[PDB]
Amino acid sequence: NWVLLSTVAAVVLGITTGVLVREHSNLSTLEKFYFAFPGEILMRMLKLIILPLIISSMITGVAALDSNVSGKIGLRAVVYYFCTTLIAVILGIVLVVSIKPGVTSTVDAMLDLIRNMFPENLVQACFQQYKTKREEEYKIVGMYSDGINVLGLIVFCLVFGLVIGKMGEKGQILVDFFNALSDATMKIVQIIMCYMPLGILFLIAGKIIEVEDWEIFRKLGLYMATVLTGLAIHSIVILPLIYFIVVRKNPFRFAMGMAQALLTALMISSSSATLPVTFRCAEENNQVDKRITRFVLPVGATINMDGTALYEAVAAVFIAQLNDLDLGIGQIITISITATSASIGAAGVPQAGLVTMVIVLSAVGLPAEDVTLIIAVDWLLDRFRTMVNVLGDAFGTGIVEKLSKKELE
Amino acid sequence: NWVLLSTVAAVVLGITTGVLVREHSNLSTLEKFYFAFPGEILMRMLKLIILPLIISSMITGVAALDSNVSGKIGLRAVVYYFCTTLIAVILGIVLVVSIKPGVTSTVDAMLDLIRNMFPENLVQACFQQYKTKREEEYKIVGMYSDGINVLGLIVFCLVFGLVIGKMGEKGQILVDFFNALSDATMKIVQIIMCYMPLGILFLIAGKIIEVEDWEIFRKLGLYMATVLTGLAIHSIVILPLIYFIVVRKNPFRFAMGMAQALLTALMISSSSATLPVTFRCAEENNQVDKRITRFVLPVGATINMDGTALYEAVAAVFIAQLNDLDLGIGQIITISITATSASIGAAGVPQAGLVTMVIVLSAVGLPAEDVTLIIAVDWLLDRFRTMVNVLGDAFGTGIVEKLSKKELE
Amino acid sequence: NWVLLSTVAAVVLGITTGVLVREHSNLSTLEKFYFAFPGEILMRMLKLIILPLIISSMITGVAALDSNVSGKIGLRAVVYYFCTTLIAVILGIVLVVSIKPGVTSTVDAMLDLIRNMFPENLVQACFQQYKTKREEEYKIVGMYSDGINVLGLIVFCLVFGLVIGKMGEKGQILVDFFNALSDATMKIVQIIMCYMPLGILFLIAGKIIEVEDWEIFRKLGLYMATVLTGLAIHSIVILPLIYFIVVRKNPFRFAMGMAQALLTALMISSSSATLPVTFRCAEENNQVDKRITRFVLPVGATINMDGTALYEAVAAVFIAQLNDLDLGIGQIITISITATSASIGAAGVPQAGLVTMVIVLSAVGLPAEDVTLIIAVDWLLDRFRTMVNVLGDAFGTGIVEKLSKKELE
Ligand SMILES: C[N+](C)(C)CCO
Numbered sequence A, B, C: 001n002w003v004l005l006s007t008v009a010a011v012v013l014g015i016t017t018g019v020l021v022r023e024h025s026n027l028s029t030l031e032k033f034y035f036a037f038p039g040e041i042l043m044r045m046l047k048l049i050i051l052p053l054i055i056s057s058m059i060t061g062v063a064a065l066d067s068n069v070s071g072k073i074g075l076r077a078v079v080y081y082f083c084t085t086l087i088a089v090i091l092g093i094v095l096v097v098s099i100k101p102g103v104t105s106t107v108d109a110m111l112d113l114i115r116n117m118f119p120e121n122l123v124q125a126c127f128q129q130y131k132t133k134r135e136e137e138y139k140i141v142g143m144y145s146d147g148i149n150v151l152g153l154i155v156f157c158l159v160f161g162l163v164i165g166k167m168g169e170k171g172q173i174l175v176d177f178f179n180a181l182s183d184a185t186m187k188i189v190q191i192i193m194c195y196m197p198l199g200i201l202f203l204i205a206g207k208i209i210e211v212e213d214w215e216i217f218r219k220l221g222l223y224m225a226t227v228l229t230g231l232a233i234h235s236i237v238i239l240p241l242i243y244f245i246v247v248r249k250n251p252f253r254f255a256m257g258m259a260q261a262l263l264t265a266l267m268i269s270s271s272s273a274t275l276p277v278t279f280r281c282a283e284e285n286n287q288v289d290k291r292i293t294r295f296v297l298p299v300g301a302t303i304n305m306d307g308t309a310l311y312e313a314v315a316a317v318f319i320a321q322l323n324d325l326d327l328g329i330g331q332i333i334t335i336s337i338t339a340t341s342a343s344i345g346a347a348g349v350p351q352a353g354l355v356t357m358v359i360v361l362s363a364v365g366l367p368a369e370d371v372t373l374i375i376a377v378d379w380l381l382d383r384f385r386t387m388v389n390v391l392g393d394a395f396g397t398g399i400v401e402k403l404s405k406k407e408l409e
């Protein structure tokens, strides 16, 4: 594949250029800023595109989710993809606080989630964010600090996406305007990813120059041991339990029937690319009828956020812990809800692991140029994330036969 | 009706909760801020929607006003609905300064009306507002303070609405895009009004807690005696004179012929809901032909701002007087022109008295959470405002028979 | 013509009012600000419209440039209209620094061209601009100062215009939405130009009042001797050489064959108005086939920026030199690239010399009210600019017969 091979060949040459400058020359504090300029322009190019990508892919992802939730079968998969998303948020927050990869009020930060879901302006929500601060027996002021409001542009586009879906023929030009705006801002991300090999070369090399000790290669080992532990309690302990609670039919036999599509997800790392394969393995091996697989698998490519909350919401807390933030427990729930929501906006993006992380790091107020620690090993962890998304969707096929049995007639 | 009954039942339970907390417990200065948080989220939800509601309803209200002003009949109703709008602005400013409900340069503030009609940026006009200040033999600086520019987003959408109406078939996708955007942002205001009973419960109760003296129940009695005096010189003295100046046929006989539609407006408080009724009473009782009633009544549901300048531009000055502002005479004309213009944007909104007031209080730089004094008694005054809008439109039927008599052949 | 006669009659009455106030009365520092208020509102009206004019005319100018570059003929005119545009930028920068009309780091300002082509936000690019500053062995901070980012709204709309052109039928509603938005924001500029005679009357008169010495009538004579010298090395020395390098057929005979359309351009000063004439003189007199004139003349009305870089990028440096700026050499290339790019956005505007200058003066951070020095003599220099655009396009017809000879079969 091109986009995988070229990114690995730019991480290898990024470390090759990176140690042949710090151990072979000596740059100033200014010339280590001009050396990381082609990787600076990539971070401006990526933040440029997340505003028409959030707005267009949330409006069309939700206005096409209607008529894919027809009946009660499409409602008994929205409850399932919210019940295992909420457990994956709790499992991602617990595992990043217990392990703490990258080390050494709370009510006023949970009421800013609900304040930022409903902004006071839709144009200010594209570049500003409401943060409140207790001061003086106390009183409370609000500031509107900078940084994009991703939570309020997603709650509004989820409401605006439901309204124009149900409007019928009067709101067909609004679905057609944003379907074409979503196709046009996924062909610009394909143009940016033709520059992304050159940009991550000078982004990796600008980090190995400034790094003086190999402690950051240990915090990058405890990060892969928090993602591969979040994505191994979910595939072994959490999701085979949820199947066995309602469907008493041995969940380790269900996964062996899907072993052709689990092994295919380790080679592509894209859920919508092996979506023709997981259709072919579910019906023939597990003996499930086609009227419920065609109703939960198209909603399971928009709503299945089990893998994001264990990978991109552990990465975005690891970056925040890397900058010596204490974060409390109220700004961790702020991050893991912004990281889980931003993956619905970065829905079918080509390099959807890199783009989603630039959305959350720009939203929660972190340096987006710290994503180059994550894309060094993103090609290992995105393969295993979509093995959970394929296994999570396959258990979402065999669960809605059991709550929907009298509905099929 | 649901939206009336539920709002009265949330004002009654708002005062019931409000006196069973201040006279039964004791909250801190912080716990009186967390008690009014469900009413804070309503004020964020309302300010969220006034930006796509101003833009879409002004573009479609004006691009559909073309072909409803065909001939000279539709021009002799635009002059009439500007001549009685300007008298209602003068009558609303005089009555709120002479009575002063809620008590105890000028050239640089009239040149900021004309500066804010033509902003220097269309994206900055969505959240910022130009205020100029004389300083030092003097010189003049400009600041761009915050708060939405409603005047400049209405003057531009009035020009942009006329241009795409007259473009014909080349500008039909622009009328279709904003017709669907206006239908989609009136179905979101219907979703907000399903939360508005809960929000105004904690908004009323958060005001009765902090109020320690019943002087504010006297300033709320002088406010209803300024609206019901502005809307009783207009229906008795001003508008029956304007009929009798040009049409010498006893205006108190004209209103008795419309008594079925005046009494219907006291039960619905919506001009476009009794618009089928005022068609049926004008032609049969007053003997007016249908070629001029169908030409002045659709422009009389977009342009008839006689009732707004006596109700929502007396309320927005009463709120400004409540915060101990002196206002001069130049910032009163700023308010009553912003309040009269913002009711064309809040054109056919369900709760169009509450939404219009949040537009003007956010525009002229006032606390939008002070609208809860007004919605306590809005269900009394909005019935009597639309009785003036029905009587003002009925006299706008019997006036254009007299200036248009040779035009009908 | 109306728009020429009325503008000359407002420059004459502007100087007539201007010397009958300063030599016949005495105004304060405040009353010389209220006297130039009708010309202030014109500068707010002009800056109001450059945001939907840049966005709509760049998207439709580029999405219609596709299928006008079919084959290799339409590629051998994009190289020619970039090779003579880059020489006109170098000739405009050299001539405004050598003559310096209006008198008496660099790497951090060339890396801000590339930083401002790719902004971090599309809504902030409509009103804000990234300027970086070296400070402290040094480090580099970035600020986001105010003023519209014209470079980043043109690079994005050039990429977004190419993507929706090549999308075919899926991106036809996006071409139809911006074709109608571009027709609707050229009919608002025609409404503004009905006020522009009144606005430039009080704009000229507000400058002759404050001027106390006639040195500014000498710097306005060295400005016309830099534009008419830039547009006389291009028409005599630069462009007849580029023809004679590749096409050995005596370029002074080519221009005599186009003498009917050169003389017509001195009477209209519009390239797309004499575009039917330069078609009729190229084929009959110079004996060129119609298959290459119809392929380079529609791309030569969007891409031919030879005349802008010698007129509007010498004017925008002359205004910057007038305010006693030193500008280095890095902020001169910033101006002449912003002035050359902004003339693709002001593509077919009626008063396209006045509107283009308000775009660049607002972009590079200059007073837009200093354009009234330029529109005093714009009707002399815009005639001679389009004589170079007609001569530059005619030599762009006789050049693509020589590189395309085996392609025509
Ligand atoms: C299923 N994905 C996580 C890949 C996209 C939904 O946000």
Ligand SMILES: C[N+](C)(C)CCO
Residues within 6 Å of the ligand: B271, B300, B301, B302, B303, B304, B305, B308, B343, B344, B345, B346, B347, B389
């Ligand atoms: C006639 N109304 C006042 C109800 C709407 C026009 O703004």
Ligand SMILES: C[N+](C)(C)CCO
Residues within 6 Å of the ligand: C271, C300, C301, C302, C303, C304, C305, C308, C343, C344, C345, C346, C347, C389
């Ligand atoms: C050819 N013009 C310069 C007139 C427009 C292209 O920007």
